[PDB]
């Protein structure tokens, strides 16, 4: 169950496998090119490959080979029986490390579900000049928001996410939320109406 990712594309899977993955990392996800089939996305030698999984309704297979009633039995099988999964050339593909579904970051300044009014609240009565956090967007599902204290109020800056690639309405697009926060720690961003939005200290979640 853990290595299944319900709502990601092949490009977010590759970028996942290259950022949080290693060689031998893999994940399952639905098929975007063809619902509702599935896809094994796997990392080997620093590159990412995808494998079609057929769902007839009675079984799951890799369009050949063994037939399994469920998706987990198929993945489990191909994890345990290394060698059974061969490309035509001769190279075998290894399912070694599942890549478990998780948050966009593990960093403490990521509060997750947290609205602008309650984030504004914490940043008032616990944030000082430069305290910031990143939080999910509630007006644009799938996207994020950097809330900052520029003392004597709080600013919100929509962080867009397109295929696991993050920017603040343009400029550079970082591979994770961490690269964005660190880059803009070194490099304060300037709001249209003049306020410069320095990031001094993260307001970590308790």
């Amino acid at each position: 169950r853990r290595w299944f990712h319900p709502n990601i594309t092949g490009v977010e899977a590759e970028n996942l496998l290259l950022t949080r993955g290693v060689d031998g990392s893999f994940l399952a996800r639905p098929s975007k090119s063809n619902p509702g089939d599935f896809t094994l996305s796997v990392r080997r030698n620093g590159a990412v490959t995808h494998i079609k999984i057929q769902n007839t309704g009675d079984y799951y297979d890799l369009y050949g080979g063994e037939k399994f009633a469920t998706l987990a039995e198929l993945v489990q099988y191909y994890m345990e029986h290394h060698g059974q999964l061969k490309e035509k050339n001769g190279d075998v593909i290894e399912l070694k490390y599942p890549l478990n579904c998780a948050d966009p970051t593990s960093e403490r300044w990521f509060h997750g579900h947290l609205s602008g009014k309650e984030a504004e609240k914490l940043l008032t009565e616990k944030g000082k000049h430069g305290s910031f956090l990143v939080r999910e967007s509630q007006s644009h599902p799938g996207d994020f928001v950097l809330s900052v204290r520029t003392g004597s109020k709080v600013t919100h800056v929509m962080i867009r996410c397109q295929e696991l690639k993050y920017d603040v309405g343009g400029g550079e697009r970082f591979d994770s939320l961490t690269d964005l926060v660190e880059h803009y720690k070194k490099n304060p961003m300037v709001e249209t109406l003049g306020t410069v939005l320095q990031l001094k200290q993260p307001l970590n979640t308790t």
Binding site: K121, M189, T192, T195
Partner: peptide, 13 residues
């Protein structure tokens, strides 16, 4: 209650 949060735009050079 509390006022509506206003998001901002960044000026990119």
């Amino acid at each position: 209650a509390s006022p509506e949060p206003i998001y901002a735009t960044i000026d990119f050079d």
